[PDB]
Amino acid sequence: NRRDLRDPDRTVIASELVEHSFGVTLDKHVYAALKFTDEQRTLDIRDYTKQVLMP
């Protein structure tokens, strides 16, 4: 603050120290899910690593 020098009133405006904050939340669940019948897994899958896991 500023006040006039040699001012008849001698009051001072006390300043405030306010700490702020914000929250960071873990709030999402990203997933990839696959369903294979016994026929699909037995007959239609050949590698399962370059055909299921890599995709």
CA distances from 12 to 33, 39, 43, 54 (A): 66, 84, 85, 69
SS3 21: coil
Nearer to other proteins, 1 or 42 (CB): 42
Binding mask 31-50 for other proteins (x = CB under 8 A): -----------xxx-x----
Q: Are 1 and 12 contacting, i.e. CB atoms less than 8 angstroms apart?
A: yes
Q: For residue 51, state whether it binds other proteins (rule: CB under 8 A).
A: no
Q: Is 25 in the site for other proteins (CB under 8 A)?
A: no
Q: Which is nearer to other proteins, 3 or 52 (CB)?
A: 52
